[PDB]
Design a protein around this ligand. Structure first.
Ligand SMILES: NC(=O)C1=CN([C@@H]2O[C@H](COP(=O)(O)OP(=O)(O)OC[C@H]3O[C@@H](n4cnc5c(N)ncnc54)[C@H](O)[C@@H]3O)[C@@H](O)[C@H]2O)C=CC1
Ligand SMILES: Cc1cc2nc3c(=O)[nH]c(=O)nc-3n(C[C@H](O)[C@H](O)[C@H](O)COP(=O)(O)O)c2cc1C
Ligand code: SF4
Ligand code: SF4
Ligand code: SF4
Ligand code: SF4
Ligand code: SF4
Ligand code: FES
Ligand code: FES
Ligand SMILES: [Mg+2]
Lengths: 43, 217, 230, 433, 59
């Protein structure tokens, strides 16, 4: 048990597309989106 | 003081509706993933991320990028123009490879942020709005970045560099020029939001799960 | 029936549910000052000129957007309402240009008339004024953007009545501006109406420019023959 | 014995945010062993009414800054479904100068936030949770996405979310540099792909919110503590702080202090004890203190005369005419220009106005010009009272509460440091004539 | 302060001062002033007719 070490170094290796890559990865577990019944408010 | 940036667009040979812009196929996959999060019939909600995505591929936002986002999302182009001119993280002009943003708000200024600003200016030879002739750096001042405890701090292309000193800011510039990337975080042997010495609290071993659970659960 | 009773200055009136404070005051024949509210456009609530005091409420409400609540007592002429109107007129006139002698809106200006009726008679603004560049949206609607009070009536009319999404606001805060952001002609068969609904001389008629003043004109109510709508 | 009177010494056994300093695994495994994601299924199975009751019994007040009671506000979505989906929005904007609590919660304890989203959505009957995070917090958002990914893989969210039978989604949407997007309605507008311009209320988000659907907007701190309150119970959380000021609180102590930091502390701790214990005191000693802004720039500042005896809770600071705000203490010693700091705050507010409504859009810029002239001394004494009235006109006449936050620091400076303004004007006149 | 024969003045550049606001025409108790205006070739707001009937004027 060491409380003197800051582990949080994952972000150092984060690139420009890391957030969007994680979004693409998470797109698989998502529940189907609800629909208002239109394609757009202008439809 | 005053903003300096204009909120009208005038066509230029380098920024016109016929300036070449298109998403990469990988960026199109990412756009599909971004679009899916929102409810059907509310596709516009993706204007904020997708626009950002364009800037993450091109570097800035030419008017053709705004037109492409508007056409992809089937949103009127003036709505994308409104979004682009409202939010300050969108670059409607080219910037340097490294965008230095130094905080100068009151908590950050109280810890000698002007020393950092002058150190950057004398190290780069440019002012608080200009871009270095090598097109590597651009220096601006920004409002509170939410890293006040670590003030003075600077934000560079998604990396915070905190607890800055004039010697410290200069070295980061040297490391960025020579083709290396510097480690983000505090620069005073702190690597946290902790007190600078002693760790006044959170020294006990963390409690095990279910330690404080109430009866009947 | 479903009518609810509300009071405007201590006087009872029956209104439909969801009726705004402005419409209830209109039922007794009182007109609340306005700049951004138009009864044929969607409610905006941005100008803040319609703020009124409700009895036993510390905060003034926006009469053009707030639905009346049963048993409410509007107070359209209280000290709080008058001071709200004076402050809002002061903020509106702070950056406005001294353009009345050259403005076509001169004798027909809602800003001028409501300044005379509900605002103060003086300025305590001692700074410089903002100035913005003009937009060119075609040969019919002359544009002098410095005069704009940012009501956003033009944006709501173009989007909702005309069916075009060419107008908008770019920037934010003091520097926020109304325009197209690009060289675009706001061309449509209903375009000229944005001159009528604009309360100031920001949007004016280009063919009509400088020719007449409203007090000298004679009004003849007639019918149009340019089509079969009459 | 009940009704304690000396608050402000609580040990680490009663701190919710045990990984505040990020000295422990920020990933799921770490959280799991630290007590996170425990008995979630049991909590979910207890039902929304039980969950709502725990929040109500605790007395939990909104940690975003307004301090509205959390249980009552969350109970506003306990209506039956009307065909529209229900949503919970987590406010992770954190734009207030002096405030860094939500950043640390997101970067170092993201699973606390994810579990809080799940439990809050269950309480509200919500379908999914949208976490609107600051655009400048790229690494914090990426850590949050990693946490959500490993929660999805372990079946802690998504379809059935547990052995529970409840489907819940968690989405992270990033802003793009706009402090006004911290306001709940402006945040909702920015999620829907528009300019971050606040809406008028009514309607409240519980009636018409994001995508026009019933929505609840909750601060990251408020959401994170939600599961610990449920397992520990409402009574335990309340047992801290004065009456109507229950629970613990994150404080960001910055400015002219020896060790600026952030720390969890009991609610009603006196300001002096908090500053001198955790922050190492004021540089130059406690007698070097000039002024303190107790809750971020939106709250009026208080002088050393008040700072030595005021408690750090909502009602106590209201009685001191300032307000608790975001619990972001900014300390300024006798070595700073007190007018310059307030002028910089007013410049921040001038640069952060959305421009929608007249009193903010015009009067905050007007106040900025007046304050910049005050800093030099260009003005006359008769303008000071004038400036006061300008603030009064702005306050309470704007759509959004940014106008209040712009007008309150000026009122504080004029209320407590008028003689400095007058002597600056006298000096400028003396060397200019 | 003596009131005599009327005159139309210029700026020091030689440009006319009158911008055709028509306030003089509105205020005149005798209706002695007649004004017609249009945009000038350079877009300036100037008069094309400016008459004073000196036998209507009360000075
Ligand atoms: N955490 C941060 O970084 C920042 C925090 N703030 C703080 O935000 C505070 C002002 O926020 P406001 O939302 O304008 O205060 P508010 O009192 O109007 O409302 C706060 C919360 O209570 C809800 N609420 C209030 N009355 C309600 C009702 N009758 N029915 C249903 N819901 C109701 C609101 O929907 C909102 O969620 C300020 O005190 C400021 O300190 C400001 C800027 C940044
Ligand atoms: C200009 C402005 C900015 C705000 N920014 C934030 C913010 O960044 N984070 C936050 O939690 N609340 C912010 N608020 C307050 C929100 O209204 C608040 O979060 C919302 O009412 C729910 O917060 P609660 O959970 O504390 O009740 C802001 C308010 C205003 C007027
Ligand atoms: S719009 Fe009205 S107030 Fe403004 S210059 Fe024209 S006449 Fe005067
Ligand atoms: S141009 Fe006229 S209608 Fe359009 S926003 Fe300005 S004042 Fe309103
Ligand atoms: S008070 Fe300021 S930020 Fe809030 S809606 Fe009005 S102009 Fe926008
Ligand atoms: S029209 Fe009359 S009042 Fe107006 S500028 Fe000309 S001379 Fe003066
Ligand atoms: S009567 Fe003569 S002096 Fe009097 S306003 Fe008319 S033109 Fe001028
Ligand atoms: S004031 Fe500099 S990060 Fe907050
Ligand atoms: S008329 Fe109500 S805010 Fe403008
Ligand atoms: Mg008009």
């Amino acid at each position: 048990f060491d409380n003197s070490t800051y582990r949080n170094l994952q972000h150092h290796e984060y690139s420009t597309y890391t957030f969007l890559d994680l979004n693409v990865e998470l797109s698989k577990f998502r529940m189907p989106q609800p629909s208002s019944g239109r394609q757009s408010p202008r439809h | 003081g005053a903003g300096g940036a204009l909120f009208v667009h005038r066509d230029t040979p380098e920024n016109n509706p016929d300036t070449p812009f298109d998403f990469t196929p990988e960026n199109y996959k990412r756009i599909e993933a971004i679009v899916k999060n929102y409810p059907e019939g509310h596709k516009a909600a993706a204007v904020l991320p997708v626009l950002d995505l364009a800037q993450r591929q091109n570097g800035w936002l030419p008017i053709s990028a705004m037109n492409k986002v508007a056409e992809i999302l089937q949103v009127p182009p003036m709505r994308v123009y409104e979004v682009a001119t409202f939010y300050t993280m969108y670059n409607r002009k080219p910037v340097g490879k490294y965008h230095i943003q130094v905080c100068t708000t009151t908590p950050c200024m109280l810890r000698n942020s002007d020393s950092i600003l002058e150190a950057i200016q004398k190290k780069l030879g440019i002012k608080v709005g200009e871009t270095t002739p090598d097109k590597l750096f651009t220096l601006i001042e920004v409002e509170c970045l939410g890293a006040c405890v670590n003030a003075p701090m600077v934000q560079i292309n998604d990396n915070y560099y905190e607890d800055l000193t004039p010697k410290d800011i200069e070295e980061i510039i040297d490391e960025l020029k020579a083709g290396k990337i510097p480690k983000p975080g505090p620069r005073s042997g702190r690597f946290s939001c902790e007190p600078a010495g002693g760790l006044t609290s959170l020294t006990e071993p963390p409690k095990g799960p279910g330690f404080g659970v109430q009866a009947g659960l | 029936s479903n009518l609810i009773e509300v009071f405007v200055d201590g006087q009872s009136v029956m209104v439909e549910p969801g009726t705004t404070v402005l419409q209830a005051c209109e039922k007794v024949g009182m007109q609340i000052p306005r700049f951004c509210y138009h009864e044929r456009l969607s409610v905006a609530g941005n100008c803040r000129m319609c703020l009124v005091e409700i009895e036993k409420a510390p905060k003034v409400v926006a009469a053009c957007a707030m639905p009346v609540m049963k048993g409410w007592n509007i107070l359209t002429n209280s000290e709080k309402s008058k001071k709200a109107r004076e402050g809002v007129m002061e903020f509106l006139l702070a950056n406005h240009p001294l353009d009345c002698p050259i403005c076509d809106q001169g004798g027909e200006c809602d800003l001028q008339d409501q300044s005379m009726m509900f605002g103060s008679d003086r300025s305590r603004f001692l700074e410089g004024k903002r100035a913005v560049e003009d937009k060119n949206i075609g040969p019919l609607v002359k544009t002098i953007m410095t005069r704009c009070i940012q009501c956003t009536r033009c944006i709501r009319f173009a989007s909702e009545i005309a069916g075009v999404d060419d107008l908008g606001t770019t920037g934010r805060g003091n520097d926020m501006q109304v325009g197209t952001y690009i060289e675009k002609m706001f061309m449509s068969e209903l375009s000229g109406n944005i001159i009528d609904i604009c309360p100031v001389g920001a949007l004016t008629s280009k063919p009509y420019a400088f020719t007449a003043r409203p007090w000298e004109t004679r009004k003849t109510e007639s019918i149009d023959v340019m089509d079969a709508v009459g | 014995a009940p009704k304690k009177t000396s608050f402000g010494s609580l040990k680490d056994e009663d701190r919710i945010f045990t990984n505040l300093y990020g000295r422990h695994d920020w990933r799921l495994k770490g959280a799991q062993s630290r007590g996170d994601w425990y008995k979630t299924k049991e909590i979910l199975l207890k039902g929304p009414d039980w969950i709502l009751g725990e929040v109500k019994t605790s007395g939990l007040r909104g940690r975003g800054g307004a301090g509205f009671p959390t249980g009552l506000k969350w109970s506003f979505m306990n209506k039956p479904s009307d065909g529209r989906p229900k949503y919970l929005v987590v406010n992770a904007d954190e734009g207030e100068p002096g405030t860094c609590k939500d950043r640390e919660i997101i970067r170092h304890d993201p699973h606390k936030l994810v579990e809080g989203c799940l439990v809050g959505g269950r309480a509200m009957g919500a379908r999914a949770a949208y976490i609107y995070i600051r655009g400048e917090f790229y690494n914090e958002a990426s850590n949050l996405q990693v946490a959500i990914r490993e929660a999805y893989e372990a079946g802690l969210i998504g379809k059935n979310a547990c052995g529970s039978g409840y489907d819940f989604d968690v989405f992270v949407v990033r802003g793009a540099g706009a402090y006004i997007c911290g306001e709940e309605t402006a945040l909702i507008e920015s999620i829907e792909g528009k300019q971050g311009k606040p809406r008028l209320k009514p309607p409240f988000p519980a009636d018409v919110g994001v995508f026009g659907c019933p929505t609840t907007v909750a601060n990251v701190e408020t959401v994170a503590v939600s599961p610990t309150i449920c397992r520990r119970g409402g009574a335990w959380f309340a047992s801290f702080g004065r009456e109507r000021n229950s629970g613990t609180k994150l404080f960001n102590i910055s400015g002219h202090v020896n060790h600026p930091c952030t720390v969890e502390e009991e609610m009603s701790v006196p300001l002096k004890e908090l500053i001198e214990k955790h922050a190492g005191g004021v540089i130059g000693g406690w007698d070097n203190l000039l002024a303190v802004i107790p809750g971020g720039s939106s709250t009026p500042l208080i002088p050393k005369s008040v700072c030595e005896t005021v408690l750090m809770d909502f009602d106590a600071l209201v009685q001191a005419q300032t307000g608790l705000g975001t619990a972001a203490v900014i300390v300024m010693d006798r070595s700073t220009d007190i007018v310059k700091a307030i002028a910089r705050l007013i410049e921040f507010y001038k640069h952060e106005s959305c421009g929608q409504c007249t009193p903010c859009r015009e009067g905050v810029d007007w106040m900025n010009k007046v304050m910049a002239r005050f800093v030099k001394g260009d003005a006359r004494p008769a303008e000071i009272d004038s400036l006061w009235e300008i603030s009064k006109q702005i306050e309470g006449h704007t759509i959004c509460a940014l106008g209040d936050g712009a007008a309150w620091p000026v009122q504080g400076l004029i209320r407590h440091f008028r003689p400095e303004l007058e002597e600056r004007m006298q000096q400028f006149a003396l060397q200019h004539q | 302060r003596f009131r005599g024969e009327h005159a139309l003045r210029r700026y020091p550049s030689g440009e006319e001062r009158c911008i055709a606001c028509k306030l003089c025409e509105a205020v005149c108790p005798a209706q002695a002033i007649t004004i017609e205006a249009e945009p000038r070739a350079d877009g300036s707001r100037r008069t094309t007719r400016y008459d004073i009937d000196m036998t209507k004027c009360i000075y």
